Each structure stands twice: as structure tokens, then as C-alpha cells.
Write an enzyme that holds these catalytic residues in place. Structure first.
Site, short mmCIF file in Angstrom:
data_model
loop_
_atom_site.label_atom_id
_atom_site.label_comp_id
_atom_site.label_asym_id
_atom_site.label_seq_id
_atom_site.Cartn_x
_atom_site.Cartn_y
_atom_site.Cartn_z
N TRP A 135 -4.28 8.25 9.59
CA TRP A 135 -4.17 7.81 8.22
C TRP A 135 -5.13 8.58 7.32
O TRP A 135 -4.74 9.12 6.28
CB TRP A 135 -4.42 6.30 8.10
CG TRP A 135 -4.35 5.86 6.67
CD1 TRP A 135 -3.22 5.51 5.96
CD2 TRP A 135 -5.44 5.76 5.75
NE1 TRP A 135 -3.56 5.20 4.66
CE2 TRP A 135 -4.91 5.35 4.51
CE3 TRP A 135 -6.82 5.99 5.86
CZ2 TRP A 135 -5.72 5.15 3.38
CZ3 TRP A 135 -7.62 5.79 4.75
CH2 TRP A 135 -7.06 5.37 3.52
N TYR A 183 -3.10 10.60 4.49
CA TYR A 183 -2.65 9.71 3.41
C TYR A 183 -3.47 9.70 2.10
O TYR A 183 -2.88 9.90 1.03
CB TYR A 183 -2.54 8.27 3.95
CG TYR A 183 -1.30 7.97 4.76
CD1 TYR A 183 -1.02 8.67 5.95
CD2 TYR A 183 -0.41 6.98 4.36
CE1 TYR A 183 0.13 8.39 6.68
CE2 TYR A 183 0.72 6.69 5.09
CZ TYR A 183 0.99 7.40 6.25
OH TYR A 183 2.13 7.10 6.96
N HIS A 223 -5.14 -7.63 1.00
CA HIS A 223 -4.23 -6.51 1.20
C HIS A 223 -3.18 -6.75 2.29
O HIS A 223 -2.21 -6.00 2.39
CB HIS A 223 -5.04 -5.26 1.55
CG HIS A 223 -4.36 -3.97 1.22
ND1 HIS A 223 -3.83 -3.69 -0.03
CD2 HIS A 223 -4.15 -2.86 1.97
CE1 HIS A 223 -3.33 -2.46 -0.03
NE2 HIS A 223 -3.51 -1.94 1.17
N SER A 281 0.85 -1.19 0.00
CA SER A 281 0.00 0.00 0.00
C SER A 281 0.89 1.24 0.00
O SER A 281 1.77 1.34 -0.85
CB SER A 281 -0.97 -0.04 1.18
OG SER A 281 -2.21 0.54 0.78
N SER A 282 0.68 2.19 0.91
CA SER A 282 1.62 3.31 0.99
C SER A 282 3.06 2.82 1.24
O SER A 282 4.02 3.47 0.83
CB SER A 282 1.22 4.30 2.09
OG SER A 282 1.11 3.61 3.33
N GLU A 332 0.35 -4.30 -3.91
CA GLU A 332 -0.89 -3.49 -3.97
C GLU A 332 -0.61 -2.00 -3.70
O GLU A 332 -0.96 -1.45 -2.65
CB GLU A 332 -1.95 -4.07 -3.02
CG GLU A 332 -2.36 -5.49 -3.47
CD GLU A 332 -3.69 -6.00 -2.92
OE1 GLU A 332 -4.24 -5.44 -1.93
OE2 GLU A 332 -4.18 -6.99 -3.50
C1 LIG Z 1 -3.75 -0.39 4.74
C2 LIG Z 1 -3.81 0.87 3.91
O1 LIG Z 1 -2.47 1.33 3.70
C3 LIG Z 1 -4.59 1.97 4.62
C4 LIG Z 1 -6.05 1.60 4.87
C5 LIG Z 1 -6.96 1.81 3.65
C6 LIG Z 1 -7.10 0.54 2.84
O2 LIG Z 1 -6.63 -0.50 3.25
C7 LIG Z 1 -7.87 0.56 1.54
C8 LIG Z 1 -7.36 -0.52 0.58
C9 LIG Z 1 -6.02 -0.21 -0.09
C10 LIG Z 1 -5.96 1.26 -0.43
C11 LIG Z 1 -5.05 2.04 0.14
C12 LIG Z 1 -5.04 3.48 -0.20
C13 LIG Z 1 -6.02 3.91 -1.10
C14 LIG Z 1 -6.09 5.25 -1.46
O3 LIG Z 1 -7.06 5.67 -2.33
C15 LIG Z 1 -5.18 6.15 -0.93
C16 LIG Z 1 -4.20 5.71 -0.05
O4 LIG Z 1 -3.31 6.59 0.49
C17 LIG Z 1 -4.12 4.38 0.32
C18 LIG Z 1 -3.03 4.01 1.30
O5 LIG Z 1 -2.41 4.92 1.90
O6 LIG Z 1 -2.61 2.83 1.38
#
Ligand SMILES: C[C@H](O)CCCC(=O)CCC/C=C/c1cc(O)cc(O)c1C(=O)O
Ligand SMILES: C[C@H](O)CCCC(=O)CCC/C=C/c1cc(O)cc(O)c1C(=O)O
Ligand SMILES: [K+]
Ligand SMILES: [K+]
EC number: 3.1.1.-
Lengths: 266, 266
Positions: B182, B186, B241, B101-102, B125
Site C-alpha cells: 500500500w 497508493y 475509517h 478510502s481508495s 472517507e
Molecule cells: C485504509 C486506507 O485505505 C489505507 C491505510 C492508510 C489510512 O488508513 C490513513 C487514513 C485514511 C487515508 C487514506 C489515504 C490517504 C492518503 O493521503 C493517500 C491514500 O492513497 C490513502 C488511501 O489509499 O486510502
């Protein structure tokens, strides 16, 4: 809507439907071979100025009057040869084609094998790998196969259980009979026949590839990789394995827009 | 295992864990910033002859003592600079890195920005598109955000509800506090920072990319296309995820095998 039959010299008596006037669009069923799944979309597509043709597949549904070779040891190349035979019989000289699953394998084989006949092909969720859990159904009794696969369709891959059920009693009665035919004839031979062993053969071809947006990534991961390697347009439709059932309006719009794109390029 | 804290010149006091001896493997958390999610895998990876380091992310969990800049308007490039700072503090000169993710965005930014420091990167992902339904949570009250996102994690993306819940009350209490951090910091800024504008910059790099097998195809479809365009290894892990939570043994095996592959290639 014309609803009729036509006999081709390979021994198949086809049930087919046709609606509309204009450039030909042909909707090839998935492995279950049941063209009433296209009912809503046929009218929507035809209304945009196309002649739309669809049919039950050999040995399935209303196309059951067919030699055993046409529904056993089935390959993409066999199915493509059968589809060309009904296009010949209906005097369809140039067609846009859609197909999902074994129908996807079929339309890619059509495009590659008969480039003078195929304007463009849309393929959806093309199976390229043997799956033992599906192959193994071929040794069960008919009623067991129908029970198992009817459940898999409804609960696992329909992409819309309500829409799936709403196909109605008569459609599901036909599918009931088709499940053992499909199981014994398709899953062990369709994936090895996938016309994707040469990515360079696909490059530059008028092919548009889709996967279902809600389909688990694993299921057709390989399609996305292969399409991208070949530079083929790859995208998503709503739902899973039966976008024409789950989302008939979006499906119809996709078919119309894609056909129009290639009519411009043509 | 070492469990401790360390402060870096940028004002962050990190909570970190470290176990094992051998080449360095660093596990970067996803956006929730919670490294207890790696607990099982850290031991399994370390036992194969690696020194494994992980940490809570700035502003999250036990690494909360940090300047507001580090957990607001967060980008891949900011996070990469912070991870380099703790690697410097811990005297980790060369490292294999994992991130989801991030954290995926972070490890690709690390590989591209600090090639001398990164042996190879595993990304999972990687978010490249703005998602309004996530971005819009940032204007809600803290407890509303926590309730909503706790539900999304469990039901939509965990890839294993039992495993997710089994993280336990201590971990989920920390996550509950992290969700608003978050949400506000984020989702509006991480996707546009994705270091994947230039496919040619990725070509030939020691990058191994994964998506969850059960993840709906639409969620990280773009990852598969981008990786394939760049010639980057692309494959699947079980679950969705959080493969390190849902399938910790398979996750550990993947990290070990991938690190071993690159140690040979070195
Ligand atoms: C675990 C994850 O890092 C944070 C919780 C959200 C989650 O799991 C949604 C599914 C994956 C999308 C993430 C994501 C999606 C976005 O549109 C923007 C982001 O910054 C993230 C981001 O920062 O990861
Ligand atoms: C509608 C479909 O065509 C027939 C019903 C099966 C189904 O929906 C399972 C999901 C898609 C896999 C198909 C598939 C998979 C294989 O491993 C082999 C095949 O020949 C097919 C095949 O012939 O299509
Ligand atoms: K629709
Ligand atoms: K496991």
C-alpha cells in the site's frame, strides 16, 4: 487594557474590557460567558490596529448583576439584543464580531438583525440540535452540574487540556459558578433559536464560519452542510471548541486577517 | 458462503467470497485490500435477500498474484477497471457497490465510468489530498512501514480498537504484509486521481456519501463540502475509517437500507 463596568437600561451591569484604537472588533464569549478566555488574543488583535472589546455575558462571571430573564430561557435573539445594548452604551457604531457556541448563534442573529451595525461576523461551532445529555444537567444540584461540566470542558472539548488548566484558579473559580447558570438557562433553548432555518437569508452575507479541526465530525457536521448550502465561507481552526484558549495566536491571526479581508471589501 | 479464486485477462488472480441470492451488492475494500474485514457484514447483508460479493484487492492479501502494474502507481481509474474485470468474470451485470478510502475513489470512478453497470454507489472517507506523512513512508524499509502503519491503523483510524484487534492473528498477518505494498503504491497517486474535480458530474447521480462520526473534522471535511455542493446525500456512520469493522451491524443495516432505497427508485 481598560477593565471597567457599564450599566445598560435592560438591567444588566456588564464587566467589559477594551484595548486598542482602530476599527471595532468585538469578541462575544461562548455559553460560559467568561471573557478572560480572550486575554492573550485581545492584545494580539489590538496591536494590529483595532479597538477590541469583550465582556462577560449576563449572569456570568463579573456580569452577574443582571435580571433573571437575561440568563434563563436564553435564545440567540435575546443575547443579540443584549450585545447591541452594550455596543450602544460603548458608542460602538460598526463592529466586526466573533462568537463561538451560543456566541456563534448570537453573532449570526446580530448580523441578520442589525446589518447596519455589523461589518462581518465570524461564527464557530454553532449549536443547532438539542442534546439530551446536556439538557438533562439542568435538573441536577449545582455542585453536580459544576463537577460534570468542568470535566467535560477539560477532557472532552477544550482542544488543549494544558491551555485550559492554565486559565488559572480565579478563572476556574468563576466558571465553577457559571456552570449551573449555563445549564439551567441555555441548552434547552439555544439550539431551537439557531438563526439558520433559512439558508437563503445567509447567502451573500459577510459571514465566515469555522469548526475545530480536532472536533469529532458528528459534533458540528450540520454547520458544514448549512454553510456550504448557503455559499458561506467555511473552514477550520486548530483545536476544538475554544480556539482562543487552545491556540490564541492562530485565533488572533484569523480574526485579524478576516477583519482585514472585509475592510478591503468594504 | 463461496470462497474461491478467479483469474482475469489482466493477469490478476483474485481471491473472492460470495454469499446470498438476489440483487448484487459488491463490497470493495479500503486500500489495505483485505476482505475478511467484511466477514460479519457479508452474512447480515446477504440474509436480507442480496447476493453479496467481495474480494481481496490486487497485490494484497490473497489476491497477491497480480502484475506489478496493478499495485504500483495506483489510481481510482485503474482500480475501477480491475473491479469491472472481476465483475465480468463473475457474470455480475448490475451491482450496488460500497467502498472506503481508495475503495471510495474506486466506486465513484465505477459509477461515473460504467453507469450501465452500477445501480448505486456508497462512498466513505474518500481521500482527495496528498498527505506527506503517509507518502513519505514509501521510502522506509518494509518492516518499518509495517510497524508504523499497524500502529496508525490501531490508534488513529480504526474507530474501535477492540474490534480492530479482534480481527485476529491471521488477518493482521496479512495486513502486515500489505502495508508496504500500500505505502509504495497508493498514497502518492490515489488522492490526485479522486474523481471529484467536477461537482456537476456528481449532481443527480445515485451516490450516497458518508464520513465517520468520530473522525476528526479536518480529515474528511472536504468530502462534506464537495458532497453538499453536488447535492449528493451526505451523512455519518459510527466510528472512523472502518465502520464495517468497528460497527458491523450498523454498517450492514446502512448498506441494506441504501440498496433498498435505490431499488425502489429504480
Ligand atoms: C485504509 C486506507 O485505505 C489505507 C491505510 C492508510 C489510512 O488508513 C490513513 C487514513 C485514511 C487515508 C487514506 C489515504 C490517504 C492518503 O493521503 C493517500 C491514500 O492513497 C490513502 C488511501 O489509499 O486510502
Ligand atoms: C461553551 C459552551 O457554550 C457551553 C458549555 C457546553 C459545551 O461546551 C458543550 C459543547 C458545545 C455545545 C454547546 C451547546 C450544546 C447544546 O446542546 C446546547 C447549547 O445551548 C450549547 C451552548 O449553549 O453552547
Ligand atoms: K497559538
Ligand atoms: K454494530
Amino acid at each position: 487594557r481598560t477593565r471597567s463596568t457599564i450599566s445598560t437600561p435592560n438591567g444588566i451591569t456588564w464587566y467589559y474590557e477594551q484595548e486598542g484604537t482602530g476599527p471595532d472588533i468585538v469578541l462575544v464569549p461562548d455559553g460560559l460567558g467568561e471573557c478572560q478566555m480572550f486575554d492573550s488574543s485581545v492584545s494580539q488583535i489590538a496591536a494590529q490596529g483595532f479597538r477590541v472589546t469583550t465582556f462577560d455575558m449576563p449572569g456570568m462571571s463579573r456580569s452577574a448583576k443582571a435580571p433573571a430573564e437575561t440568563y434563563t430561557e436564553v435564545t440567540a435573539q435575546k443575547l443579540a439584543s443584549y450585545v447591541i445594548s452594550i455596543l450602544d452604551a460603548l458608542d460602538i457604531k460598526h463592529a466586526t464580531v466573533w462568537g463561538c457556541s451560543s456566541g456563534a448563534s448570537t453573532v449570526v442573529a446580530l448580523l441578520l438583525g442589525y446589518p447596519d451595525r455589523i461589518r462581518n461576523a465570524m461564527c464557530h461551532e454553532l449549536p443547532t440540535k438539542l442534546l439530551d445529555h446536556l439538557s438533562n444537567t439542568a435538573v441536577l444540584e449545582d455542585e453536580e452540574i459544576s463537577n460534570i461540566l468542568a470535566n467535560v470542558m477539560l477532557n472532552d472539548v477544550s482542544g488543549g487540556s494544558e491551555a485550559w488548566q492554565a486559565l488559572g484558579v480565579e478563572v476556574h473559580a468563576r466558571l465553577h459558578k457559571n456552570y449551573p447558570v449555563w445549564a439551567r438557562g441555555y441548552p434547552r433553548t439555544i439550539p431551537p433559536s439557531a438563526p439558520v432555518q433559512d439558508v437563503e437569508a445567509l447567502r451573500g452575507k459577510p459571514l465566515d464560519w469555522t469548526v475545530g479541526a480536532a472536533t469529532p465530525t458528528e459534533s458540528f457536521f450540520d454547520n458544514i452542510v448549512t454553510a456550504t448550502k448557503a455559499g458561506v465561507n467555511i473552514g477550520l481552526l486548530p483545536g476544538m471548541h475554544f480556539p482562543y484558549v487552545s491556540h490564541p495566536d492562530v485565533f488572533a491571526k484569523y480574526v485579524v486577517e478576516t477583519t482585514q479581508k472585509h475592510l478591503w471589501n468594504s
